[PDB]
Design a protein around this ligand. Structure first.
Ligand SMILES: CCCCCCCCCCCCCCCCCC(=O)OC[C@H](COP(=O)(O)OCCN)OC(=O)CCCCCCCCCCCCCCCCC
Ligand SMILES: CCCCCCCCCCCCCCCCCC(=O)OC[C@H](COP(=O)(O)OCCN)OC(=O)CCCCCCCCCCCCCCCCC
Ligand SMILES: CC(C)CCC[C@@H](C)[C@H]1CC[C@H]2[C@@H]3CC=C4C[C@@H](O)CC[C@]4(C)[C@H]3CC[C@]12C
Ligand SMILES: CC(C)CCC[C@@H](C)[C@H]1CC[C@H]2[C@@H]3CC=C4C[C@@H](O)CC[C@]4(C)[C@H]3CC[C@]12C
Ligand SMILES: CC(C)CCC[C@@H](C)[C@H]1CC[C@H]2[C@@H]3CC=C4C[C@@H](O)CC[C@]4(C)[C@H]3CC[C@]12C
Ligand SMILES: CC(C)CCC[C@@H](C)[C@H]1CC[C@H]2[C@@H]3CC=C4C[C@@H](O)CC[C@]4(C)[C@H]3CC[C@]12C
Ligand SMILES: CC(C)CCC[C@@H](C)[C@H]1CC[C@H]2[C@@H]3CC=C4C[C@@H](O)CC[C@]4(C)[C@H]3CC[C@]12C
Ligand SMILES: CC(C)CCC[C@@H](C)[C@H]1CC[C@H]2[C@@H]3CC=C4C[C@@H](O)CC[C@]4(C)[C@H]3CC[C@]12C
Ligand SMILES: CC(C)CCC[C@@H](C)[C@H]1CC[C@H]2[C@@H]3CC=C4C[C@@H](O)CC[C@]4(C)[C@H]3CC[C@]12C
Ligand SMILES: CC(C)CCC[C@@H](C)[C@H]1CC[C@H]2[C@@H]3CC=C4C[C@@H](O)CC[C@]4(C)[C@H]3CC[C@]12C
Ligand SMILES: CC(C)CCC[C@@H](C)[C@H]1CC[C@H]2[C@@H]3CC=C4C[C@@H](O)CC[C@]4(C)[C@H]3CC[C@]12C
Ligand SMILES: CC(C)CCC[C@@H](C)[C@H]1CC[C@H]2[C@@H]3CC=C4C[C@@H](O)CC[C@]4(C)[C@H]3CC[C@]12C
Ligand SMILES: CCCCCCCCCCCCCC
Ligand SMILES: CCCCCCCCCCCCCC
Ligand SMILES: CCCCCCCCCCCCCC
Ligand SMILES: CCCCCCCCCCCCCC
Ligand SMILES: CCCCCCCCCCCCCC
Ligand SMILES: CCCCCCCCCCCCCC
Ligand code: NA
Ligand code: NA
Lengths: 497, 513
């Protein structure tokens, strides 16, 4: 009867009734911690229920932290656009440049020629490709450069419920594969570098974690969880015609024609971006960041430097004969990317969302909420450490679904640092579970910017994404526990304290 | 001689690449001339200045230069320069842009403009005055470019309706056309200085104050408004008199009033969304004003000192735009089971906001703040103060006149925001070296960098007006020369008479030393 009427106004009802429901939190724990927890819970609920746009919810700290006395405006506001956000913006601009010159179509047609007209094989090929791209570029960047290519593929082979299901599956597998792939390498995603920095700050003695050890530990995790995710996606979606379809694919590739100068320039700039990102500071061989002051340079500097070239590099081959040829027309050349097209195609909502995550992370750190959570985790000492770490990675994997991976790893890593020494257990045996599990962001489009990029297409629903992310999180947690039980104990020698 | 012309044309064709690849080569000697950190910071600042003035790179891309240059050159680490791009001043700017987008999306701006045009009159001088008043009062909150772009069609329609012999009549017609087409961008530029969110340079002043003098907080929305609004009104009246004398000659009226009515009636009745947006904008302005007027204790005194700012108020106000319904809610909807259950539309959707907010200006403000921070940390400001030794005996008032004239005539070629970004550290150092309040030199520069009246390339509103075709460059120059002179004189009067009381510039402050 009235259920439809109530559901019609669900957004306003959530907006007005969430602070009322979260009010007892403020009185439950100490004042500043209570206010910070209230803000975190309000932001998480508004993100899950989509009561407000993800950017508008991301701007909540600017209003709530100063009013509640947690952080001043001049402290919460600068956190919104940190160097990690600049790296993400540079990756988004690079993806926009790649898509703007129809290089994504070329890559898509090459992938179809390599694989063939089979939805499951194409899905697996994109899982592999996006995971490979995620080990060297950040998850958001790989997702932004791979959704255009996936959409090109889908428009290629398909030119009714089966088609729509393939749409859903092959548009949702890309952000999920990127999130899975970010974990294997330290350079793969920001939370790994955050973990390394927090380990260096907290534990100068502990230095067993490097690029090689982390890679050999986490690449099997990539393979296992990627196979599990691919099987889950295939089961959920999709369970002389072939010659004609392949002939159409060759015809489309020929219709693409020879590769233009702008396409090659953009591809070379992308390759330089990836190479300079990887070689900036490897943990086994010093990078070119050692040629400068220590700690001055980061991935943001490289991203902005590479992106700046796109805005002045010519999109046509420059000929020295033009200067001598007085008969040639004197027309201005088109750069690789104009700022108008970039501003049109850059998702500033994702930038604001990441900034809100950073701001809420700093608010949690400054208000003393993290210390309070660490203190409340005290009675988890008579409980055996194995399933204790299991439940810790469970709660981390189910908390990263609201905020960004960076925000949740920053929030939870010092808590685990205090907890591990308090409980007489190996610090890494808690460091690495949380760092890996923060990337297990699969429920909501707000969980990670890859999910937002995928959801921006409009072919994905919240219900289907949550249904997939349930089992994705469960298998990720189980594989994390298995890794910590079998081969993490010997690679990182964390089985003996 | 034709070969030289062809070579010059070819050089001008590739001027952007030539400037971009030759500016570092030309600016290399400053690194060797100066101490290392100061020299590198000066090289970066001059490179950004040249790139902004010549438009070799997009303004946003040039604003991202510090993120590359400061970490490489050791001036400032990445984790210290990157957060400078969203200081709370930039979030106040973003909130103002969101409010302006909400106002424009519901045609409230057109309704206000047409109402003011109806009220002011139809007489030539009265029509010019009403057009200028509308453009200036509407540029306080909208961008000057948007106000000019909306007001040009209305002025064109009114002029066509009004004039629907020999040299006298058509000369008068063309002069009247020129007067209306020149009165809009000048009024927009004048009005932009009235409010902090009116134009970017005011927020640049705020952000660079946050860096050079973190202890300085006397400049806020209320103080800036109470300082600039009388000055804006005086300069607007002076410009109106000047334009009317130059051009306005200081049934047709019935037809013009009829076309204004028809343009107003086409807006339809005032809808609930327009009223809601107007009320939200009024609360926005009032709460920005009354947060800390500095002469009545504002509502910020009810919370922790130093925690609240104009950014918090702006974000809180513009948050309501994204969930407040656009249609009037009805209590009977719950009772009426037969009514459709269609989802309601908010006042502003994030799609429209994202597609109607100029993120380029946000990045430009962030780049300016980052450059100010780098100049402060690198010690280049101390070097500039040391080198400003000869300019120590100059009277402070004469110094204000000279800096205002220089900045007002410099902005005629480059962007106002870039001009103020480049000039603000120099003004700060000169004010420090003169044993006078830093604001006494910062505020004249911030106000005068918007005194861009002489060229179509000075401001985008000037280009919009020039695109009509009824105006020549000579008219621009003749009007803007005396416009600049009058603006400089009025700015000096304001800075010497009543800005002293508003900003307490009489005594050198403790935080300035
Ligand atoms: C589209 C066309 C181009 C548009 C360009 C837009 C920007 C233009 C800005 C104005 C022109 C550039 C600034 C002036 C030239 C560069 C500054 C300079 O000359 O610095 C080096 C110089 C060295 O002096 P030195 O030999 O040390 O003196 C003896 C004691 N050592 O130092 C001195 O002589 C000392 C005095 C310095 C005074 C301040 C100079 C910098 C002002 C701007 C700072 C930002
Ligand atoms: C914060 C308190 C709440 C908000 C302020 C108080 C309520 C204001 C009225 C409600 C909103 C009105 C609609 C929104 C547009 C603004 C008004 C406007 O220009 O509408 C035109 C109308 C006059 O023309 P109308 O009679 O509608 O013509 C057709 C019928 N013959 O106009 C009118 O009839 C109304 C004229 C209103 C004049 C307001 C003057 C300024 C009030 C203080 C503003 C403070 C902030 C300034 C920045
Ligand atoms: C539905 C969404 C918005 C909120 C869901 C969580 C709510 C219902 C939870 C979170 C924390 C909870 C509080 C935590 C602790 C206490 C103290 C004790 O007296 C029991 C009730 C009380 C006061 C709880 C009430 C319910 C509570 C406020
Ligand atoms: C609602 C979902 C997302 C889980 C979020 C956990 C929050 C809402 C709940 C779970 C556990 C709860 C806490 C459990 C124990 C205590 C200690 C007691 O002395 C006061 C209440 C307090 C401090 C509770 C506050 C609310 C709390 C932190
Ligand atoms: C059929 C077998 C024997 C030979 C296949 C050769 C061609 C089709 C293969 C060999 C190497 C392949 C490339 C290897 C890596 C990448 C990078 C990835 O981000 C997009 C696809 C792309 C660009 C592949 C496209 C297809 C490719 C060029
Ligand atoms: C162009 C691509 C390959 C990246 C840039 C080149 C990289 C690989 C080069 C350029 C400068 C090089 C560094 C220069 C000097 C040293 C000091 C030496 O004691 C250890 C290696 C180390 C730290 C080098 C590592 C490799 C390095 C970083
Ligand atoms: C300064 C020295 C190195 C020589 C000049 C180098 C640079 C500035 C020159 C070399 C080749 C030139 C290009 C050659 C041809 C064209 C195509 C024409 O339709 C627009 C200009 C454009 C795109 C020129 C721009 C300037 C250019 C890139
Ligand atoms: C919700 C996010 C932000 C934080 C992570 C969850 C936190 C709040 C949860 C996870 C584990 C929880 C604790 C689990 C067990 C106990 C013992 C009980 O006798 C009192 C509550 C207490 C001490 C809980 C307090 C809240 C707690 C620390
Ligand atoms: C880029 C254009 C528009 C502005 C002018 C840039 C060049 C020509 C200017 C900027 C600053 C100047 C330098 C400033 C100071 C000195 C020290 C002394 O030895 C005199 C020459 C020398 C070394 C100047 C040489 C020319 C110079 C490098
Ligand atoms: C909310 C607005 C738009 C309409 C309501 C009237 C305005 C003028 C009201 C609402 C709240 C009011 C403020 C509430 C509290 C204080 C603190 C007191 O020590 C001085 C007056 C001052 C600073 C009030 C000034 C007037 C004020 C700003
Ligand atoms: C304050 C608490 C107690 C009650 C809140 C009631 C709110 C959520 C109700 C009251 C009136 C309602 C509106 C009444 C009529 C319509 C038109 C119809 O197309 C549905 C949306 C819309 C626009 C409703 C949205 C929800 C609404 C605003
Ligand atoms: C539009 C024009 C004609 C009117 C304004 C003219 C300007 C230049 C005049 C008007 C008021 C004047 C100021 C009034 C009083 C003083 C105090 C005196 O101890 C030094 C000069 C100083 C600071 C004057 C400087 C010049 C001044 C600013
Ligand atoms: C005085 C009470 C302090 C604790 C509760 C604060 C509640 C703030 C709610 C803000 C909601 C913003 C989105 C509608
Ligand atoms: C203990 C001193 C502060 C008391 C109030 C804290 C909560 C303030 C909430 C303000 C919310 C404003 C929403 C627009
Ligand atoms: C046939 C291809 C020849 C080489 C083309 C190179 C284009 C530009 C690549 C990116 C260069 C970035 C540094 C200037
Ligand atoms: C070793 C010399 C240091 C000083 C000169 C550095 C020059 C950097 C030029 C950067 C240009 C960026 C825009 C093309
Ligand atoms: C004294 C230690 C640093 C030496 C080099 C300083 C200048 C570096 C310039 C790098 C420019 C990079 C442009 C992309
Ligand atoms: C007779 C007056 C009718 C007014 C209709 C529009 C009301 C808009 C109210 C907006 C309130 C925003 C803050 C809650
Ligand atoms: Na996350
Ligand atoms: Na304006």
């Amino acid at each position: 009867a009235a259920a439809k009427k109530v559901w019609s106004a669900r957004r306003l009802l959530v907006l007005l009734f969430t602070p009322l429901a979260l009010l007892p939190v403020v009185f439950a724990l100490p004042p500043k911690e209570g206010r910070c927890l209230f803000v975190i819970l309000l932001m998480a609920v508004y993100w899950c229920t989509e009561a407000l746009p993800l950017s508008v919810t991301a701007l909540l700290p600017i209003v709530l932290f100063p009013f509640m006395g947690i952080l001043p405006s001049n402290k919460v506001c600068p956190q919104y656009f940190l160097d990690t956000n600049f790296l993400f913006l540079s990756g988004l601009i690079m993806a926009s440049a790649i898509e703007e010159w129809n290089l994504h179509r070329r890559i898509a047609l090459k992938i179809l020629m390599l694989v063939g007209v089979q939805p499951a094989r194409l899905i697996l090929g994109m899982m592999v490709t996006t995971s490979f791209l995620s080990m060297w570029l950040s998850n958001t960047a790989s997702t932004a450069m791979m959704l255009p290519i996936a959409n090109a593929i889908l428009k290629s082979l398909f030119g009714d419920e089966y088609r729509r299901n393939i749409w859903k599956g092959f548009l949702i597998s890309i952000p999920y594969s990127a999130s899975i792939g970010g974990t294997a390498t330290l350079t793969g995603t920001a939370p790994n570098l955050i973990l390394l920095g927090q380990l260096k700050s907290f534990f100068p003695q502990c230095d067993v974690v490097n690029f090689g050890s982390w890679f050999i530990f986490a690449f099997p995790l990539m393979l296992l969880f990627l196979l599990a995710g691919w099987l889950w996606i295939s089961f959920l979606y999709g369970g002389n015609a072939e010659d004609r379809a392949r002939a159409v694919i060759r015809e489309e590739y020929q219709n693409l024609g020879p590769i233009k100068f702008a396409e090659q320039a953009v591809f070379i700039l992308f390759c330089m971006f990836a190479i300079l990102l990887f070689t900036r500071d490897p943990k086994f061989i010093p990078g070119w960041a050692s040629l400068f002051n220590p700690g001055f340079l980061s991935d943001a500097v490289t991203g902005v430097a590479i992106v700046t070239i796109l805005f002045f590099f010519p999109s046509q081959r420059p000929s020295l004969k033009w200067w001598f040829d007085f008969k040639a027309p004197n027309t201005e050349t088109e750069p690789l990317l104009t700022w108008k097209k970039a501003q049109e195609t850059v998702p500033w909502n994702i930038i604001l969302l990441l900034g809100g995550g950073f701001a809420m992370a700093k608010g949690c750190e400054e208000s003393g909420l993290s210390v309070w959570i660490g203190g409340q985790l005290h009675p988890l000492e008579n409980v055996p450490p194995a399933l204790a770490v299991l439940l810790i990675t469970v709660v981390i994997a189910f908390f990263t679904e609201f905020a960004s991976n960076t925000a949740t790893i920053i929030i939870f890593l010092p808590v685990l640092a205090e907890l591990a020494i308090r409980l007489r257990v190996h610090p890494l045996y808690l460091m690495i579970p949380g760092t890996v599990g923060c990337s297990f962001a699969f429920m909501l489009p707000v969980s990670t910017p890859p999910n937002s990029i995928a959801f921006a297409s409009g072919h994905l629903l919240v219900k289907d994404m949550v249904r997939t992310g349930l089992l994705m999180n469960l298998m990720g947690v189980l594989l994390l526990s298995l890794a910590m039980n079998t081969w993490a104990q010997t690679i990182f020698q964390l089985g003996t304290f």
